[PDB]
Amino acid sequence: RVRARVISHALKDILAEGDKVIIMGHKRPDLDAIGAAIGVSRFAMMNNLEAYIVLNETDIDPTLRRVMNEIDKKPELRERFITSDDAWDMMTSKTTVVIVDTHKPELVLDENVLNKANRKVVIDHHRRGESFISNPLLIYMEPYASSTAELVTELLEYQPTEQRLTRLESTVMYAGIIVDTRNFTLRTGSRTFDAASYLRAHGADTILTQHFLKDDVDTYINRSELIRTVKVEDNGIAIAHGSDDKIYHPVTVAQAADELLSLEGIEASYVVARREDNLIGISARSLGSVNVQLTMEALGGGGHLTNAATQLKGVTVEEAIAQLQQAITEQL
Amino acid sequence: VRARVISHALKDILAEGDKVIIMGHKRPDLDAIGAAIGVSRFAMMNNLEAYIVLNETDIDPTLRRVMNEIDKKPELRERFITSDDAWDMMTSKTTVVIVDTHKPELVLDENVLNKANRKVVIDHHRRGESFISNPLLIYMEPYASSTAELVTELLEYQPTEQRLTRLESTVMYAGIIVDTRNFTLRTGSRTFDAASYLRAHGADTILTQHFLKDDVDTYINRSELIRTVKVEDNGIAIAHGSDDKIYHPVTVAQAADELLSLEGIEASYVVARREDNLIGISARSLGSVNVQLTMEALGGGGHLTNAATQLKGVTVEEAIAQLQQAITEQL
Ligand SMILES: [Mn+2]
Numbered sequence: 111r112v113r114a115r116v117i118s119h120a121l122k123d124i125l126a127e128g129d130k131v132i133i134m135g136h137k138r139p140d141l142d143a144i145g146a147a148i149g150v151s152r153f154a155m156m157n158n159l160e161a162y163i164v165l166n167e168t169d170i171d172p173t174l175r176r177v178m179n180e181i182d183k184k185p186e187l188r189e190r191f192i193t194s195d196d197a198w199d200m201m202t203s204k205t206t207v208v209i210v211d212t213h214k215p216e217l218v219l220d221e222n223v224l225n226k227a228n229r230k231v232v233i234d235h236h237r238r239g240e241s242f243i244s245n246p247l248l249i250y251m252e253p254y255a256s257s258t259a260e261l262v263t264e265l266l267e268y269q270p271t272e273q274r275l276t277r278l279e280s281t282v283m284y285a286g287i288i289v290d291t292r293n294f295t296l297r298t299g300s301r302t303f304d305a306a307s308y309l310r311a312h313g314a315d316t317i318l319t320q321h322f323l324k325d326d327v328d329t330y331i332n333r334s335e336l337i338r339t340v341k342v343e344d345n346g347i348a349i350a351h352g353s354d355d356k357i358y359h360p361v362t363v364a365q366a367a368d369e370l371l372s373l374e375g376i377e378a379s380y381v382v383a384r385r386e387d388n389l390i391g392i393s394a395r396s397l398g399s400v401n402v403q404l405t406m407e408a409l410g411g412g413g414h415l416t417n418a419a420t421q422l423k424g425v426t427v428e429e430a431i432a433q434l435q436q437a438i439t440e441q442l
Numbered sequence: 443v444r445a446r447v448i449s450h451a452l453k454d455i456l457a458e459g460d461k462v463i464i465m466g467h468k469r470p471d472l473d474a475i476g477a478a479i480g481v482s483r484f485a486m487m488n489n490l491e492a493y494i495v496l497n498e499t500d501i502d503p504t505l506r507r508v509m510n511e512i513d514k515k516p517e518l519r520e521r522f523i524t525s526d527d528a529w530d531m532m533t534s535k536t537t538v539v540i541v542d543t544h545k546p547e548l549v550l551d552e553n554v555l556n557k558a559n560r561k562v563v564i565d566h567h568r569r570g571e572s573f574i575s576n577p578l579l580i581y582m583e584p585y586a587s588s589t590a591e592l593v594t595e596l597l598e599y600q601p602t603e604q605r606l607t608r609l610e611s612t613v614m615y616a617g618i619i620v621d622t623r624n625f626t627l628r629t630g631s632r633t634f635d636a637a638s639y640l641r642a643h644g645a646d647t648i649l650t651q652h653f654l655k656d657d658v659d660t661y662i663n664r665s666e667l668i669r670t671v672k673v674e675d676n677g678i679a680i681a682h683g684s685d686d687k688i689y690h691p692v693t694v695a696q697a698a699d700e701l702l703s704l705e706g707i708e709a710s711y712v713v714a715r716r717e718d719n720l721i722g723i724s725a726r727s728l729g730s731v732n733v734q735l736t737m738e739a740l741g742g743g744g745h746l747t748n749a750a751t752q753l754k755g756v757t758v759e760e761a762i763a764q765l766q767q768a769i770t771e772q773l
């Protein structure tokens with residue numbers, strides 16, 4: 111964590127050297143993007159700098175809308191959020207733009223604001239890709255961190271404490287970590303917990319966080335409809351499916367596969383369900399022993415060791431299942 | 443600095459006696475076992491002789507999954523002994539460390555506790571009526587998530603040549619997971635500090651998940667109930683089992699708990715037959731709607747957020763009608 115100290119003070123000099131700070135994450139921002147951004151704006155405010163977060167009404171999905179409702183009703187946080195246009199009008203060549211939770215120009219919330227910026231900072235927890243923000247004054251990329259919220263939280267700890275992180279700000283930063291880690295089950299290191307400690311110390315509300323993230327009744331029902339069918343082999347391979355005649359939401363199929371991993375005896379889950387009139391979807395997950403990337407690549411799809419997917423043209427659910435088992439027996 | 447003071451005081455007490463006997467509560471859960479394992483690592487860090495009392499009849503199915511892993515590590519497996527062996531090896535200079543409880547009658551083996559001349563108590567519950575007599579040291583903190591969290595703090599101030607192992611860390615961590623329902627309850631910054639320390643010592647999330655796997659049958663029973671839920675505009679939800687199927691009381695309770703995790707639901711009522719002549723209802727609430735009053739109105743009771751009742755002599759449909767009438771009245 112030598113890096114966090116140096117980066118925190120280097121960041122503060124860059125931000126203070128400019129006339130003000132404009133913060134953006136990726137398009138259709140999730141709670142890590144928004145929590146990280148909130149975090150940076152608190153970073154700016156601890157040093158009495160002027161900071162805004164770019165967000166348009168059309169960027170606000172249902173999860174984020176629950177966060178924003180809370181922000182409107184219970185603090186003064188809303189004043190920091192500004193539209194693209196207001197962002198544009200307000201920028202000068204001395205304005206520092208900080209990009210959080212992405213590093214590809216084409217994924218940035220507003221690429222025009224990005225292109226107008228002479229001064230850029232990038233903070234993200236993925237590894238550098240093909241595209242990358244051009245000519246940044248400072249790059250803070252940590253592939254092994256849980257989330258951008260975690261990275262930003264660490265930077266806060268080095269800054270003056272007079273203008274402290276508020277309860278609601280820390281709650282959104284916390285929610286972002288919860289989402290990116292699947293409640294501390296993925297990409298969670300001791301430093302993730304260090305960040306969780308700092309945030310909870312500043313009032314991060316675990317109950318409110320749960321509230322932002324509740325699924326609805328229909329999703330639970332559709333999902334359990336898939337789970338109910340599960341057949342678990344002795345080797346820990348579980349297959350579940352929807353009727354050939356029922357269309358399922360792709361996310362519901364993914365969730366079903368996720369949830370089967372919480373059940374006794376299941377090492378790897380495969381959920382098979384109609385996605386379109388002429389397309390069958392499969393989502394696969396595993397706890398690391400069985401490689402589902404391999405299974406799905408054998409069926410013309412792909413992904414990663416623990417989570418992959420494929421889609422099959424012009425087959426019935428029963429045919430897809432048979433193709434799937436053929437692949438499994440071959441692989442295992 | 444209080445934990446620092448407790449850590450060092452406890453070390454002198456343990457090194458003063460001839461050996462250490464560690465004991466949790468009857469029917470130990472993962473926090474009681476995790477804490478006990480932590481106290482045994484505490485002892486080994488100072489090259490002291492420590493055992494954990496555990497009888498085969500004290501090992502429920504969750505704990506068995508854990509003991510299956512511990513069996514793979516003889517160094518750790520050998521620390522676990524029966525009540526008989528503990529009693530037999532105890533002396534006037536043996537220190538007994540009671541973890542995760544403070545009531546004599548709740549301790550795993552009261553006979554061992556009664557034979558003990560030197561006692562230490564580490565727990566995270568509010569002190570009540572009966573209490574361990576004449577403790578040399580007491581570490582009680584009703585705000586902590588768990589005893590594992592408490593013991594982790596003590597470990598931090600001890601020599602590190604003989605560190606907490608990956609498996610030991612994992613069990614302690616799983617204890618915190620169970621007691622906080624995955625950082626959702628009774629969880630403070632210090633809880634996360636403990637998690638950080640355990641994780642730095644290799645605490646394994648995937649193994650923890652293995653310990654806490656849910657049975658498939660029961661997931662399927664629970665969801666049969668949930669599937670039926672009907673949610674009113676006021677956030678009141680009612681779910682039911684069919685009139686001809688008996689559900690286990692614990693499954694009904696879990697279903698009621700699970701409904702509160704769904705959007706728009708302020709209070710849940712789950713109605714399922716529990717016998718040939720008895721209908722059960724578990725009621726739960728986020729804390730706004732009072733289900734104690736509803737249940738009391740139906741000849742039951744409990745608490746504001748969590749209550750229940752049993753209705754003799756009605757079908758599920760009648761129980762539902764009567765429940766709605768109570769709900770209407772309350773409103
Ligand atoms: Mn993101």
Ligand SMILES: [Mn+2]
Pocket residue numbers: 142143211235256257258290
């Ligand atoms: Mn992220």
Ligand SMILES: [Mn+2]
Pocket residue numbers: 467471473474542
């Ligand atoms: Mn306990």
Ligand SMILES: [Mn+2]
Pocket residue numbers: 473474542587588589621
């Ligand atoms: Mn406990």
